Ligand binder design. Structure first.
Ligand SMILES: [Mg+2]
Ligand SMILES: [Mg+2]
Ligand SMILES: [Mg+2]
Ligand SMILES: [Mg+2]
Ligand SMILES: [Mg+2]
Lengths: 114, 178, 79
RNA sequence: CCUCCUAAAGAGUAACGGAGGAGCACGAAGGUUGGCUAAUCCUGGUCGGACAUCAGGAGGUUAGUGCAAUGGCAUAAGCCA
RNA sequence: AGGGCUACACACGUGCUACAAUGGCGCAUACAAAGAGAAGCGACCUCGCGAGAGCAAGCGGACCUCAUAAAGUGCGUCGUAGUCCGGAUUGGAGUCUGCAACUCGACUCCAUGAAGUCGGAAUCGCUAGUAAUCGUGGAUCAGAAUGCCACGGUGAAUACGU
């Protein structure tokens, strides 16, 4: 089922399968099910339809994909269009957390440019 | 003609006094929705065209008009002919019924829609806003489609001014943004 | 970032900005306590945060408070 | 061999005069019947940006014409079936 | 005083962690050595999801504390998928240290979840409790170990020959 949106996590255990949501993680799923009166060893796929409509209802509390990434960027933008070291780092594509650029950064920055 | 009647009823008069019109045969009438969706691309796939068409063929109860090029002098490419779109205007009943289809279930079936443009109008008094992405609304299945969609929509009313264009739609259920 | 509970700043800026807040806006602020946090009273104030060579101009904005003056002054010159 | 100027408002006229083209192409790019009409700019529109498709407004043969140039073409010779 | 030594298109050395099913994860559970400690190690109890906080006993030590070994084993699950693999990255919010965490601290919660499917030419260590792998402690030090030094658990293969 689309559930939070599109995402059709099936043939898997309720927990993990539920984490498929672009906004929920292991912790959220392992707790959301119980709160929704749902087990974990249960395959959402073969899950009772009615029991699915419950997940959606409770998962709606947490922010996901849509409004998630939407705001997740807003924040960045803020400190970015502010002038703080954090922002500067973003526009420059360098590690904001404050790592070492002289070496190791293939993640934050592009690979090689010899 | 569900919303159509509403026009003659609630609307018309609302404007007849607000806009202080003299003849009922003046009130800015709704002159067919247009719909276009300039899919373009083609070349790469060419099949996505009929796809964007079949999609529109669903969004609308009529038959899509796969348009062609015209100038040919296109950097992208294009050579006089060559498929590139599918307008597909609206037909009276289907038109208003459509004006109903959306604004009541389409615009409602948002993505984050927190208000609608209040300037998507023109100089004459016609509005045209892009959905940005086909909300999958009552179309051939839902999770069964293809790489996004999106399209354009234009109202076009006998409004002698953009202002009068506001009255119309406003008398209806145009969500807008304010 | 984190510093438990209690926004901290150096007296210097406080005594100066506080007097400014009341005496209204005016010339910038010569301070090195970049490690100090930005408060709402400094909002719209003229501050000159030094980095290593000289001070730099700054305008305390809303979304610009829970931070430190220092992060608004690039220490190292690059390209 | 074709087109314009030279060529003195009929035809026609010379130069080792000034400028370009032809040696083909189409079973439709012929026939007829029926229908259509641009270029370009402005404005407003998902991805559409200088420049695609869409909506209006201005505009009016400045488009188009299988290929040069001249003349012609809306009753269109231009466009679709 | 503040900044710099933590700069960056880049290149090289030494390492840490992965690419998984000789495994991940859940639950239950068995065996160790060697050390450190009165501006110290800090229990029990209480609160907090957690880092940690409040109160506060004991030990200057075969008495007390750091301190709950990890592999392993039993059951269960996942069924080979870039995955319940792998965790960089970043975002939001916090804890503690210390005047002081912007540049530049360690850690926690939730979310995010990249590279990576065992690595070319070439090259390194190791002959036995060795290699491989698993955990544990200490010096430095307010607070920044995958480094260094040290400890024990499990525990191979191969050596014709020059
Ligand atoms: Mg003559
Ligand atoms: Mg436009
Ligand atoms: Mg150094
Ligand atoms: Mg110690
Ligand atoms: Mg220590």
């Amino acid at each position: 089922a689309r559930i939070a949106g599109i995402n059709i996590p099936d043939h898997k255990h309720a927990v993990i399968a539920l984490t498929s949501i672009y906004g929920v993680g292991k912790t959220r799923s392992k707790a959301i099910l119980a709160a929704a009166g749902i087990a974990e060893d249960v395959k959402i796929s073969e899950l009772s339809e009615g029991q699915i409509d419950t997940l959606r209802d409770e998962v709606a509390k947490f922010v996901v994909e849509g409004d998630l990434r939407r705001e997740i960027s807003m924040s960045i933008k803020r400190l970015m269009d502010l002038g703080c070291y954090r922002g500067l780092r973003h526009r420059r594509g360098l590690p904001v957390r404050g790592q070492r650029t002289k070496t190791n950064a293939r993640t934050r920055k592009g690979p090689r440019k010899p | 003609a569900k919303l159509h009647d509403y026009y003659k009823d609630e609307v018309v008069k609302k404007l007849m006094t607000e806009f202080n019109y003299n003849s009922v045969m003046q009130v800015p009438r709704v002159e067919k929705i247009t719909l276009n969706m300039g899919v373009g691309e083609a070349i790469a796939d060419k099949k996505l065209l009929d796809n964007a068409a079949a999609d529109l063929a669903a969004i609308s109860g009529q038959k899509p008009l796969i348009t062609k090029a015209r100038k040919s002098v296109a950097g992208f490419k294009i050579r006089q002919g060559y498929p590139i779109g599918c307008k597909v205007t609206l037909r009276g009943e289907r038109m208003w019924e459509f004006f109903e289809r959306l604004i009541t279930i389409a615009v409602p079936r948002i993505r984050d829609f927190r208000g609608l443009s209040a300037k998507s109008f023109d100089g004459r008094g016609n509005y045209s806003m892009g959905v940005r992405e086909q909300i999958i609304f009552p179309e051939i299945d839902y999770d069964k489609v293809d790489r996004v969609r999106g399209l354009d929509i234009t109202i076009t009313t006998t409004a002698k001014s953009d202002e009068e264009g506001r009255a119309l739609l406003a008398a209806f259920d145009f969500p807008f943004r304010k | 970032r984190s510093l438990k509970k209690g926004p901290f700043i150096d007296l210097h800026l406080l005594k100066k900005v506080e007097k400014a807040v009341e005496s209204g806006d005016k010339k910038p602020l010569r301070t090195w306590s970049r490690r100090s946090t930005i408060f709402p009273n400094m909002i719209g104030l003229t501050i000159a945060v030094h980095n290593g060579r000289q001070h730099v101009p700054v305008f305390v904005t809303d979304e610009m408070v829970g931070h430190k003056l220092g992060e608004f002054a690039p220490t190292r010159t690059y390209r």
